Every structure is written in C-alpha cells, then in structure tokens.
Amino acid sequence: WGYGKHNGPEHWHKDFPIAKGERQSPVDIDTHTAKYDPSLKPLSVSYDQATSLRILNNGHAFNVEFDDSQDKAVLKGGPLDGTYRLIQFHFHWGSLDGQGSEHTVDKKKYAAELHLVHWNTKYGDFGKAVQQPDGLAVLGIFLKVGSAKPGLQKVVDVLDSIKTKGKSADFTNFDPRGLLPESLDYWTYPGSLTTPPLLECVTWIVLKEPISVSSEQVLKFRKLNFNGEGEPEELMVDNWRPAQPLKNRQIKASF
Ligand SMILES: CN(C)c1cccc2c(S(N)(=O)=O)cccc12
Ligand SMILES: [Hg+2]
Ligand SMILES: [Zn+2]
C-alpha cells in the first residue's frame, strides 16, 4: 500500500476490509456540531522523562521512537482512563502548504499534522494494545506555515541522513515538549489508525490550537523519499488519508 494512484487510500479496502468500518479516521471536525462536554478532564501530559532513541524512514513517513519500557513519557486525564505511554511520533504533510493534515476543521486543511502515539499500559505492550477498543490514544497537532518552530529544528536537521526507505539514525535527547502548542484545549472521538492495518483501537485527541513552522522547515519534509536507495526517486509528499464518514459517532469538545 502507499499513497499513489494505484496503491493509495482508495485501494486499501482490498487488502484491509476494515477500511470501510464504522470508526475509521481521520474525520472532518464540524466545530458547530461538536458537543461541549463539561465532564471532560484536562489533559495531563508528562513528557519530562522522555527518552528518544532513533529516527527512521519507513517508506510512508519518518518516525521518532522512544524508550517505552517504563512510564517515562505518559499521557492521561482528558477522556482517558489509565496511563498511556508514548512510543513514537510522526507527521503527515502535503506537496503544497494548503494540504497535508489528515483531520480537517470545518473542512479546513492544514500544511501538516503531528501524531504522538501512545498505548494503554494495562495491556503490557503495544501489540496487545492494538487488540483492544481502548488500547491506543493518539494526540494530533496541526501545523500551519508561518514562523519557525525552534523545537522542530533538531528533527529537520537530521532528515538528510534518513532520506530513503529503511534508513535510520540515532536520535537521542529530543524533548517533544517543544512541539506542543500553548493551549491543551481539544476535540476527541473514537477512531482508528490512519494507515493500514487501520485498526479501530484509537481514542483520538485533536488539539484546537495549531503550531507554526516555517516554510523552510516544511520544505525539508518534502525532500524525503518513499523509495529505497538506488531506486527511482519518489518524493515523500501527500502521505495523508482523506476524511472518513463520521457514522454513528459524536465529537466532544473540552471547550
Ligand atoms: C502501528 N503503530 C505504530 C501505530 C499505532 C497508532 C497509530 C499509528 C499511525 S496513526 N496515523 O493512526 O497515528 C500511523 C502508523 C502507525 C501507528
Ligand atoms: Hg482494536
Ligand atoms: Zn499518523
């Protein structure tokens, strides 16, 4: 599978039937129909003990992996029950600044979208978590083009070393707190992974406030490759899935 004409999102259902399921992501967030829920607790993000280990190009995007062997970087509160460990974060972006995000707000598309993946610790490991309706929690953050995000530069500079599919690089001491917006106000709904296997095990938490990154920073994202070394160059752009039908789901807002 991929994001091309012959293997893109519209073809995924053939190999992964769940693509046409009841709680698929992403979705369009209609701000006017979202239900303000006063019982939603504030988000608790404890990223001070985070330990980043490696950065890798997997052929669809690049991932920054964290040591999830202990409660070092955890997420809790909000609509969540229990503790969720940060295992990795990645992005989705477009070829142009007007597209790239997976979730949209009132049909509005952002330049990119950051996903911080966490798994429910009561399940022992990520692999067991993907077998539960509440096994994962993904924190989604929109990126818009404007001023440079200082905390993103270290990621942007290492991109040269993982240009092609399969390449990885040591990436220690990265602090994800530098990618967070000022406000933790959010929207939440039950969904799925946005890439195959598209499992419906995710509690999505999409932040209302976007972070700004510069044109130069976003440009470097667009210099990565979908292909492996030695193969014809396919620029890794537009690695996002279109919005899926909300179906029988309600989007709740913490505000
Ligand atoms: C398989 N593992 C690593 C995953 C868990 C949860 C979400 C994932 C997403 S996404 N786009 O849904 O956040 C993309 C790729 C892998 C994911
Ligand atoms: Hg599941
Ligand atoms: Zn993602």
| Residue 178: burial class (beta carbons within 10 Å; 0-12, 13-18, 19+) | middle
d(CA 210, CA 215): 15
Element (H, E) at 205: strand 202-207
- Of ligand 1's atoms, which has the minimum distance to the CA of residue 87? 3
Query: For tokens 């939603």, what's the residue?
Result: 40
Pocket test for ligand 1, best of 57, 193, 201, 205 (most atoms within 8 A of CB): 193
d(CA 95, CA 222): 7
Handedness of CA 50, 94, 142, 221 (dihedral sign): positive
Task: Tell me which fold the domain 1-255 belongs to.
Answer: Carbonic Anhydrase II (3.10.200)
Report which residue type is found at 5: K
Kindly state the tokens that stand for 203.
């509690």
Residue pair 36/255 in contact (Cβ under 8 Å)? The answer is yes
- Of ligand 1's atoms, which has the minimum distance to the CA of residue 25? 12
SS3 label, residue 188 = strand
Kindly state the tokens that stand for 95.
């070829």
Report which residue type is found at 72: K
129 φ/ψ angles, rounded to the nearest 5 degrees: -60, -40
Residue pair 80/137 in contact (Cβ under 8 Å)? The answer is yes
Pocket test for ligand 1, best of 84, 141, 195, 205 (most atoms within 8 A of CB): 195
- Of ligand 1's atoms, which has the minimum distance to the CA of residue 201? 6
Report which residue type is found at 38: P
CA nearest 224: which of 129, 96, 123, 93? 93
Annotated binding site for substrate: 194-195
CA nearest 111: which of 222, 192, 254, 231? 222
| Residue 113: burial class (beta carbons within 10 Å; 0-12, 13-18, 19+) | buried
What DSSP string describes 124-148? SSHHHHTTSTTSEEEEEEEEEESS-
Query: For tokens 């399969």, what's the residue?
Result: 166
Q: In the annotation, is 60 catalytic?
A: yes
Resolution in Å equals: 2.1
Ligand 1: which residues within 6 Å by Cβ? Answer: 115, 117, 136, 138, 193-195
Going by CA atoms, what residue is nearest to atom 9 of ligand 1? 193
